[PDB]
Subunit: 345 residues, 4 copies
């Protein structure tokens, strides 16, 4: 095909999704795939579900000439991406699914990710990949830092509201949920079927790494420092993500106003659906898709409102959005290869 | 076994749990079971997993005679409990698992249920069955309204904290989660394995019938009306529940105080357990038992705390606590038959 | 788009699957749908996961104008399919997902379904929709009976083997499994999440309607009446379907011969993959795709072999195969709208 | 209270299960516990759900003296047990839950295990722990080999049937299914929730370690070499196990006879249950507890029948029978501390 894709760290779930999504993309084509321990192996022996496809052999990052492709999808772990990306060709449009360029504050990166920022310089040219919000900058960006799943369900619904001054910036409490696929494919005892199902549990209480990402974006729009609470929970399900967002509306504002602002901000946006007031979204309905459904409800507390936002954490919350961004970055229609219908039931 | 037990409405999940629980209870024996459309059938017919024990033929409550019965576990379908209980022979210890005798305020009951209260006078002698809290009243109470599942996880950690003014009573936000077993065994579209599996949903938003039961308690301890923001979330699992609670500490108060307070209130309690600092509880760890685990964490927002309380929605959230009550309501050790240890994995 | 699609009975998983499969289909675009029990309602009110699509409002069968459609997919309720289809307009390609036109022997239809065939003559022009095996007739048929899900897993690897007399037709023992989605969306106790989750059980032991359908296809090749043993099992999962088949090898035959025959028979087939010897299939690998995988292994019992055939029961086991049949009936590319990559994880 | 019990190999799910079971055993109390790899840690730190239990701190086998305990349960890894049980004081009653003493034929041990046997002589005084079949030998015995999971569900129906010459011992084909809890807590990619959920799989095809164990049990009864076909299947669930068994009845034998025979054999059995003809058992019926169900069904194939047996793979399929065996090795009632009722749902 017309476009050769470089996919770093292809043995993980987001890599697998990058392979699945590109499969029905009439333009792009995976020609180079990187893996660490599984190098020197057909991805078939890694992800047999992809057997209908004929892909390249997995090689190590060290053994790969990046002059091989046009654009790069980076799905490597946080803290291993900065020195790699900085050492990549300049004529390469890049979309790293990792969090090594989402935060502009160098010191902030270090305090939350435990080590100095390596590509301090490159950083300032990076655009945050929240498509429906920064589309214009994403279009002309060379390097894009695909957002994190959770932060995606938060900013999309909250940004427009804060921009319209429809909600206060203080006391925003976020109670989020995610399938265990968000934990990755690492062979950890904690993630076994017997340690995930038939029970639920919180995690990342207080100091969760998605906090600065959330607060940054909201601060930009509120033009003031925003401090929130964020308590994610781990579900005995594979795919899906929901954030139950408890906010205080601005003086004199009613849920109807929040609903209208959201409805107006996303009325022509394919991937963001604002449900009719009162309607409850289910992650089941966006599962295996790139869509995000959101709804507005009154809080039993005066002046407060309840926002619910759901996505398939692996798609709109990962590789789906990444593809969405590369699409426009390369000048192709934004929805190319992104119109899969939900796999419900 | 000297105590003869009557189970009114044995074809549901609460009825089944009662039978299961009493099976190895040293002093209580099920001698009477009633069902509506199952009258005439054996229990094994309805619930075949109970086939190891001898149980009485299922008769109609209308033809039941309490001459040789000594205590009642009423699990009748919301709508007939009110009148059936009023007309029950006065001279026993009736543990009501329905919600009909929970609210002390007739008006509130009317409001939250539309229909008029049908046993206004008897309502005055009912005691709320949140054991650890109202133990002394329950031991000598006639009619006991067993708390609802969610309310149990909410009041246990909060009542102590309010009684000590360690946390403010306003802006208490509860983001609760529950397994689908709490939706009973009714044959409905939204309860089929296919519909429920994978994914969660926010049901009963803004208003849910547990709200008045929650506020009641909290209000009775705060000596002032309490208005919370409670939100149910259905989990793709059978058992377990978590009410992640967000509270504002009282001036000068720190997480340690709340931690020490709870640590001291349930210190010698067999069922309420407080975990160390920073330890996140899991519903997986209480599944199948009558234990509630609770933990306190600081919220990222200055002055706020986060409390997590988990139980097995059907045990401590229902049939287990009901039996915990009937024990004392009969003069036995409060833990008799309730020592079942978690079924993990 | 070129072809207008008529879907009768779109309120079930079959119809939802049709609608999902046709969403990104370039030539066929649904424009008519029926669902008496929900006529006038929106598709979003039945299957909200389809909200990104704009579909015609649901109608009644007696109201739909079957002259406005070029092709139809039939999901009528078993027992009501014959009359509706037999009376369907003249010009029209028809694919029935029901089992009512599968059996080519009216006598067997009655003794297995308890009712006479109401479209005897029409039955004669019907071609069994097991694609890879009957493609030739399918292309020129006007009315196709889409096969059952289980029967597909069995006939696919067995027909080719029986062809070349590689296996005896005596004592073919089948042990299959399907996700509960095969039970449909009917609101019944048996299929409640709490009743199905975390457990399995056989069903349809000894006798089961798919039996005659399976034997019929195998009988075609064996040129002799085949009598099998077929046992269904209900799996605690939504989609997916596997068949574990135990067969006797004919004199002189080795497992390698069965493998070679299958590899040769399906080497060009897009949707039927024959795995390498010793490799085990996983329904997880053909979940949400039209893809099918199979593998053969030696039995510990000398002379016997094992044949595992997996599919997504909602795809090749139903609608996926349905569409595979219509594509070629209308002379379109058989793979059109059917190359969806598996959803994994 | 009286008997002091230790626990060697208190690390996997079988160890945690033994403790759960003894947690309320009226006459046996756990006073010792080994977990070398994790010695110096609290049992809770490994299994938080056991927090309510006051348990002995984990000690190394090296640092453990077996004069304080009266009997020992062994849950050590395979290939490590023979040496330990080798050097134990005969004043100890022992129950090994490993595979190390199940097969009497030393050669077979080495072939199916890759390593030499290291306890020839001792192996001669070992009794096979299928309690309801070898009870008498188990009582008057010191050492006991606790049967495997699958082998238990198979030998229970077949042994009595073969003993009464009611079924032929040729072509015995078993298609088994098991929850993923049986694989253990080991950190394996394959057993992650994201890899296991919503899909089943076959494994141990043709050859599986339980094969020799199963055949030895059946061969000893039939008094002839019995070669079976046995194919395990991994279920996306925690507990539960079913071995659908296809056999051929003896000349002039009807399913009525097999059924009627199972009745005689297990007429006064608390744990094994022969269901009424036509009733299909479900792993949900005995899940959590130490029960199993099984009946006989006619096959569609001539002189064949389909037997189904279910058990929770962790209880009667592991630590439950072990205790059943020890109770009678110490002279206490066989049901002592094993009357736990199924946790259904």
């Amino acid at each position: 095909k017309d476009i050769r894709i470089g996919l770093l760290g292809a043995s993980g779930y987001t890599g697998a999704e990058i392979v699945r999504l590109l499969a029905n993309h009439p333009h792009f084509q995976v020609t180079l795939m990187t893996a660490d321990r599984k190098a020197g192996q057909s991805m078939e022996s890694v992800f047999p579900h992809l057997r209908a496809q004929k892909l390249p052999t997995l090689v190590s990052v060290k053994d790969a000439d990046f002059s091989t492709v046009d654009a790069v999808f980076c799905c490597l772990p946080h803290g291993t991406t900065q020195e790699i990306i900085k050492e990549l060709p300049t004529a390469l449009k890049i979309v790293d699914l990792s969090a090594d360029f989402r935060l502009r504050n160098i010191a902030e990166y270090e305090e939350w990710y435990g080590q100095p920022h390596k590509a301090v310089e490159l950083q300032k040219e990076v655009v945050y990949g929240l498509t429906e919000i920064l589309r214009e900058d994403i279009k002309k960006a060379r390097l894009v830092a695909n957002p994190g799943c959770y932060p995606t369900t938060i900013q999309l619904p909250l940004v427009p509201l804060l921009k319209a001054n429809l909600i206060k910036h203080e006391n925003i409490i976020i109670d989020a949920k995610s399938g265990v696929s968000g934990a990755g494919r690492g062979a950890k005892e904690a993630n076994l079927y017997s340690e995930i199902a038939e029970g639920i549990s919180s995690y990342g209480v207080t100091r969760h790494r998605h906090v600065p990402e959330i607060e940054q974006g909201l601060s930009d729009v509120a033009q003031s420092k925003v401090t929130v609470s964020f308590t994610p929970h781990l579900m005995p399900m594979i795919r899906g993500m929901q954030s139950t967002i408890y906010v205080e509306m601005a003086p004199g504002v009613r849920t109807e106003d929040l609903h209208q602002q959201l409805k107006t901000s996303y009325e022509d946006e394919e991937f963001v659906k604002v449900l009719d007031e009162g309607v409850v979204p289910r992650t089941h309905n966006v599962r295996g898709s790139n869509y995000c459904h959101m709804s507005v409800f009154p809080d039993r507390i005066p002046g407060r409102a309840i926002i619910i936002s759901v996505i398939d954490n692996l798609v709109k919350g990962a590789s789906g959005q990444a593809l969405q961004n590369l699409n426009i970055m390369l000048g192709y229609p934004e929805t190319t290869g992104l119109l899969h219908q939900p796999l419900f039931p």
